[PDB]
Curated annotation (Swiss-Prot), chains A, B:
Residues of the full protein shown: 33 to 198 of 198
Subcellular location per the Swiss-Prot or TrEMBL entry: Cytoplasm; Sarcoplasmic reticulum membrane
Keyword Repeat listed: yes
More about this protein: This protein is encoded by an amplified gene in multidrug-resistant cells. This protein has been shown to bind calcium with high affinity.
Positions that bind Ca(2+) 1: 51, 53, 55, 57, 62
Membrane topology, as annotated: Peripheral membrane protein
Name the record gives this protein: Sorcin
Organism: Homo sapiens (Human)
Source organism superkingdom: Eukaryota
Length: 166, 166
């Protein structure tokens, strides 16, 4: 029985489940209660990806630009989500980063994947957060790399200002 | 009336609130339903702050250290709050960072303020996340800063791998 594995994984010593255990039991079974918004951190990264003014806010044009990009990434995610699990394999995030063409080493790409991995899988929220953060940091690095050297001279305060803003 | 402000903020043009509105109204007024855990991001940062071998996991010795550091930062947060509301203004954040030993410029503090403050102020979670990220980023910078010059030349691949992991 397919459901028994989900049951036994949360069941107590009495061989039964209570409300809390049922909540976790139903979720992994495939029955969700509803949709949840993006994490606050993910939204903050989005704002910092598109804020040219450095006001910590976003205008309407930039929002349109964000929606189109998010919908594009969602369509790619749904395409790879085989069983509507809401998660994809860590290897699949590695490919997405590579396809961005920011030119990262395999040792960098894989270590990035590791951080956004929850029990050997990456969620939709983490997939987007990782993608958004990579882009915003790359743009920040490029704004400073005026000679196009691939190297940036970072004074401590400028480094803190740069990374803490993203 | 002291309570009127919280009411009118969520009330419709009828002077009446529903259950959804009462939820947001009661929290602002000074009555919370309970405690919530740290955001997953804040916890991810904490693991990253004490990770010595890129494991992405934490041992017990490191956990004991974390708890002491957190309890210390908590104790300082409550002495600034003086309202038990669990929220603090940017000015009291600038004071808190200086005490821990941060030589950050007002410009850097401003960028932190724009990232972690909503509707005017910063939560305890964002306060902690900010502290954790600053310590870990300062450590990353410091370890690349040969002869204590306060300047680091960052290659792109190392910059990304470094900051994405924290």
């Amino acid at each position: 029985d397919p459901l028994y594995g989900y049951f036994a994984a949360v069941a107590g010593q009495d061989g039964q489940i209570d409300a809390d255990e049922l909540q976790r039991c139903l979720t992994q079974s495939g029955i969700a209660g509803g949709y949840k918004p993006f994490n606050l951190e993910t939204c903050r990264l989005m704002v910092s990806m598109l804020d040219r003014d450095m006001s910590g806010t976003m205008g309407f044009n930039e929002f349109k630009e964000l929606w189109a990009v998010l919908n594009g990434w969602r369509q790619h995610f749904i395409s790879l989500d085989t069983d509507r699990s809401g998660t994809v394999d860590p290897q699949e995030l590695q490919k997405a980063l590579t396809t961005m063409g920011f030119r990262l080493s395999p040792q960098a790409v894989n270590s990035i994947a590791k951080r956004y991995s929850t029990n050997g899988k990456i969620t939709f929220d983490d997939y987007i957060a990782c993608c958004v953060k990579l882009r915003a940091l790359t743009d920040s690095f490029r704004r400073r790399d005026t000679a196009q050297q691939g190297v940036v001279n970072f004074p401590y305060d400028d480094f803190i200002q740069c990374v803490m803003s993203v």
